[PDB]
Design a protein around this ligand. Structure first.
Ligand SMILES: OCc1ccc(-n2cnc3ccccc32)cc1
Length: 284
């Protein structure tokens, strides 16, 4: 079926939970043996969210190459994304090592450091120009260059230096600051505006390594971001945009990381975002 009318048909019939449970039943199951080794317990935030072995990002280290991060490679859309958990106190150096080694231009953050009165990820970037951060375990230096605070999101320019070679690179930090502590946003307008700002920066384009996107577990809000982006790109590429099937795209992405889209409300929000976004791309 088309999307917008499949949407109204699920709303009127109140069957979002049944649709979402079908997706969970059909989703791929691949091994995640490296994630579960005892030496990696303090490298995982949640015991039930792990990268598959076949798609995990490897650190370029011989001691321990493990990080909780996955490469999502979308062949028809010609887009790739790295989805990862929010960094832990003992993985902030690994996180920036990955950004460096994978040649990423942008980092997309979809959570606040504290939500619901608890810490959802480490404070992993510097907050003042004159107070830079040094990660001694991976030999990197990170400096805040500039910060632009808007009503729904903040964009930061960062300098990452590999202290071993003295090479430097400019990284863009795109921080969506207004996702509610409970539920999903009422309108997708600010989330779509944010997605378009990431696109306009070059961070999603083939002349760079994959964008790094995270929330707390790296599967819920993070899954919503890449699902909406890929569906909109396919609607631009195909002769028949109504052929794009958001459930089929989500199941393809779940071949590369488990659990993408965590609730039926996140599934409905993803439909809403793609529907509204497809009107702005053209003229309605
Ligand atoms: O790239 C954004 C983009 C491109 C095309 C379209 N689009 C045009 N006609 C359509 C019919 C059905 C569904 C989507 C449609 C939307 C969004």
């Amino acid at each position: 079926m088309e999307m917008e009318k499949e949407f109204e048909q699920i709303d009127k019939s109140g069957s979002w939970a049944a649709i979402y449970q079908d997706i969970r039943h059909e989703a791929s199951d691949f091994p995640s043996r490296v994630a579960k080794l005892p030496k990696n317990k303090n490298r995982n935030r949640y015991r039930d969210v792990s990268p598959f072995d076949h798609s995990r990002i490897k650190l370029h280290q011989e001691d321990n190459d493990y990080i909780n991060a996955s490469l999502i490679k979308m062949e028809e859309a010609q887009r790739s994304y790295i989805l990862t958990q929010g960094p832990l106190p003992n993985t902030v150096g690994h996180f920036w090592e990955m950004v460096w080694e994978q040649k990423s231009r942008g980092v997309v953050m979809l959570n606040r450091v504290m939500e619901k009165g608890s810490l959802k990820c480490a404070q992993y970037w510097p907050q003042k120009e004159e107070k830079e951060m040094i990660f001694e375990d991976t030999n990197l230096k990170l400096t805040l260059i500039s910060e632009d605070i808007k009503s729904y999101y903040t964009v930061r320019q960062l300098e990452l230096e590999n202290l071993t070679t003295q090479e430097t690179r400019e990284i863009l930090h795109f921080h969506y600051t207004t996702w509610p502590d409970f539920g999903v946003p009422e309108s997708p307008a600010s989330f779509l505006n944010f997605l378009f700002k990431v696109r306009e920066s070059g961070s999603l384009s083939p002349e760079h390594g994959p964008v790094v996107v995270h929330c707390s577990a790296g599967i819920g809000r993070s899954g919503t971001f890449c699902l909406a982006d890929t569906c909109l790109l396919l609607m631009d590429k195909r002769k028949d945009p109504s052929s794009v099937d958001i459930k089929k795209v989500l199941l393809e992405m779940r071949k590369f990381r488990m659990g993408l889209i965590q609730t039926a409300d996140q599934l409905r929000f993803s439909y809403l975002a793609v529907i509204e976004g497809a009107k702005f791309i053209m003229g309605d």
